[PDB]
Amino acid sequence: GQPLHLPIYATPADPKALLSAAVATSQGGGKLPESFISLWRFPHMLENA
Amino acid sequence: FANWVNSLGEKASPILTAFENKTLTAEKLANAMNLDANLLEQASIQAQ
């Protein structure tokens, strides 16, 4: 009962290549607040800022 | 859907923003999968 033919040999499966996706988002920029005038002249307000 | 996006990988941003618009085509989609576009065309036609 030993077969004369030799058995066929299986081919192993292909492994999966794990891949990541890196995307970026776009947040909208902020606008300016309102111009509020003050009492001070230029150099004092400049140094303060 | 997340696994599909991870399957895409590198070309994900243009195809996702093309899907975000209503102008997504088969041809841009095939190039991200390295598949021939006519296959997706015929699959769409068979579903139709």
Side-chain angles (χ1 to χ4, degrees), chain B residues 2-43:
Chain B
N3 292 317
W4 180 68
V5 171
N6 289 318
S7 175
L8 292 174
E10 294 180 354
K11 295 180 182 179
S13 295
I15 192 168
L16 284 175
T17 189
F19 181 76
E20 184 180 2
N21 196 358
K22 293 182 179 180
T23 182
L24 179 62
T25 66
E27 290 82 4
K28 184 177 179 179
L29 197 149
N31 200 1
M33 294 180 185
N34 298 318
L35 296 175
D36 199 359
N38 296 320
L39 185 65
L40 298 176
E41 296 171 359
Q42 291 303 114

